Design an enzyme around this catalytic site. Structure first.
Site, PDB file in Angstrom:
ATOM      1  N   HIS A  76     -44.987  76.620 -77.139  1.00 53.76           N
ATOM      2  CA  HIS A  76     -45.927  75.415 -77.553  1.00 53.76           C
ATOM      3  C   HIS A  76     -47.064  74.541 -76.548  1.00 53.76           C
ATOM      4  O   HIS A  76     -46.455  73.515 -76.704  1.00 53.76           O
ATOM      5  CB  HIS A  76     -45.571  74.810 -78.965  1.00 53.76           C
ATOM      6  N   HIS A 127     -54.743  72.053 -81.019  1.00 53.99           N
ATOM      7  CA  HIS A 127     -53.932  72.102 -82.112  1.00 53.99           C
ATOM      8  C   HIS A 127     -52.711  71.185 -82.089  1.00 53.99           C
ATOM      9  O   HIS A 127     -51.952  71.165 -83.288  1.00 53.99           O
ATOM     10  CB  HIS A 127     -54.290  73.371 -82.638  1.00 53.99           C
ATOM     11  N   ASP A 135     -53.738  80.834 -84.706  1.00 49.61           N
ATOM     12  CA  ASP A 135     -52.575  79.844 -84.200  1.00 49.61           C
ATOM     13  C   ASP A 135     -51.836  80.874 -83.910  1.00 49.61           C
ATOM     14  O   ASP A 135     -50.768  81.603 -83.087  1.00 49.61           O
ATOM     15  CB  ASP A 135     -53.001  79.307 -85.759  1.00 49.61           C
TER      16      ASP A 135
HETATM   17 MG   LIG Z   1     -49.134  73.730 -84.886  1.00 49.03          MG
HETATM   18 ZN   LIG Z   2     -50.505  76.358 -82.627  1.00 49.68          ZN
END
Ligand SMILES: [Mg+2]
Ligand SMILES: [Zn+2]
Ligand SMILES: CN(C[C@H](O)CO)C(=O)c1nn(C)cc1NC(=O)c1nc(C2CC2)ccc1Nc1cncnc1
EC number: 3.1.4.17
Length: 313
Positions: free
Chosen positions: A68, A106, A217
């Site tokens: 991430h 995000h 994503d």
């Molecule tokens: Mg996320």
């Molecule tokens: Zn993400």
């Protein structure tokens, strides 16, 4: 205005394709993003002095975590670029502005822990935000950086267009909470199947942007096998550390997060491709036919994981 960005020939060609990997040169990612904003949006969308300062503050506020991270931010923005360029006429100027920025921001300040581990840890962010904990935090961080001086990349928008775009960004970021994806897809599926889906109904657009955000994503599962396989290690490195931290709290984690249960990973990817990825990209291709290449690439990778189980790799 007359300062365009160019990429090398290989990148200039391969960046239009959905399975494009942004590569291991960190210092090229900012230009890759500006290139994508200028072509998707126009060279007039953003003051370059402000966009570039905005991009560097967002980079600064991602953390050095295995998955991430800053690379994820740009990877998810590139997948959204590809979708927009394959559905040129379906989206407003503000949505194209908003969504690429939504994508880059995000996962701002992600620590590598799920919403569940924040709840069980009893993190202060779970007291401030009871559902979509990290996602409301990510949107909070995006507003903060937009309010830093010289960073308001939307300054030329009217009060109302400014509030439309932040709304687009808020909903877009909240949609990346997978726990919300399942319902959102099931309602898009029914609306498509009963021919009631309508892109002039703002509530419907919201849902459809929702599904795009999940698709972008998860887009590490739509790469070429060697990229998907190598990124899977980065995602599991976070899962195993979270599982370790669960054991530290006195809770035996789910198997997917138990680093003592690596043997179960291929079979766990099957479930994940079957329960999450394939449905997500099936419903997207149905609503947006030019996104078929994401479903195809997702199916190839599923097929590759079956081969791993059959010990053919
Ligand atoms: Mg996320
Ligand atoms: Zn993400
Ligand atoms: C089954 N559910 C969903 C639960 O129902 C609710 O969380 C899972 O989340 C799940 N179960 N298993 C065994 C693996 C899972 N997720 C993943 O592998 C996984 N996740 C995410 C985000 C959404 C968290 C992004 C990529 C993922 N993989 C991956 C593969 N290759 C390259 N890059 C990434």
């Amino acid at each position: 205005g007359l300062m365009q960005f160019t990429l090398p020939v290989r990148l200039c060609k391969e960046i239009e394709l959905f399975h494009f990997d942004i590569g291991p040169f960190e210092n090229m990612w900012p230009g890759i993003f500006v290139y994508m904003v200028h072509r998707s949006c126009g060279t007039s969308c953003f003051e370059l002095e402000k966009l570039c300062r905005f991009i560097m503050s967002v980079k600064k506020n991602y953390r050095r975590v295995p998955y991430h991270n800053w690379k994820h931010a740009v990877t998810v923005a590139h997948c959204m670029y590809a979708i927009l360029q394959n559905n040129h006429t379906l989206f407003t100027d503000l949505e194209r502005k908003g969504l690429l920025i939504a994508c880059l921001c995000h996962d701002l300040d992600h620590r590598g822990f799920s919403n569940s581990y924040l709840q069980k840890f009893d993190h202060p962010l779970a007291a401030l935000y009871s559902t979509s904990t990290m996602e409301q935090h990510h949107f909070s961080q995006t507003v903060s950086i937009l309010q830093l001086e010289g960073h308001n990349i939307f300054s030329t928008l009217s009060s109302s267009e400014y509030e439309q775009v932040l709304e687009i960004i808020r909903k877009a970021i909240i949609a990346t909470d997978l726990a919300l994806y399942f319902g959102n897809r099931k309602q898009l599926e029914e609306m498509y199947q009963t021919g009631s889906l309508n892109l002039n109904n703002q509530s419907h657009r919201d849902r459809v942007i929702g599904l795009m955000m999940t698709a972008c994503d998860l887009c590490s599962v739509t790469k070429l096998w060697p990229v998907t396989k190598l990124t899977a290690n980065d995602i599991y490195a976070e899962f195993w550390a979270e599982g370790d931290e669960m054991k530290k709290l006195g809770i035996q984690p789910i198997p997917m997060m138990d680093r003592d249960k690596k043997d179960e990973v291929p079979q766990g990817q099957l479930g994940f491709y079957n329960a999450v990825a394939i449905p997500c990209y099936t419903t997207l291709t149905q609503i947006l036919p030019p996104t078929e290449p994401l479903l195809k690439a997702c199916r190839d990778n599923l097929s590759q994981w079956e081969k791993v189980i059959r010990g053919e790799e």
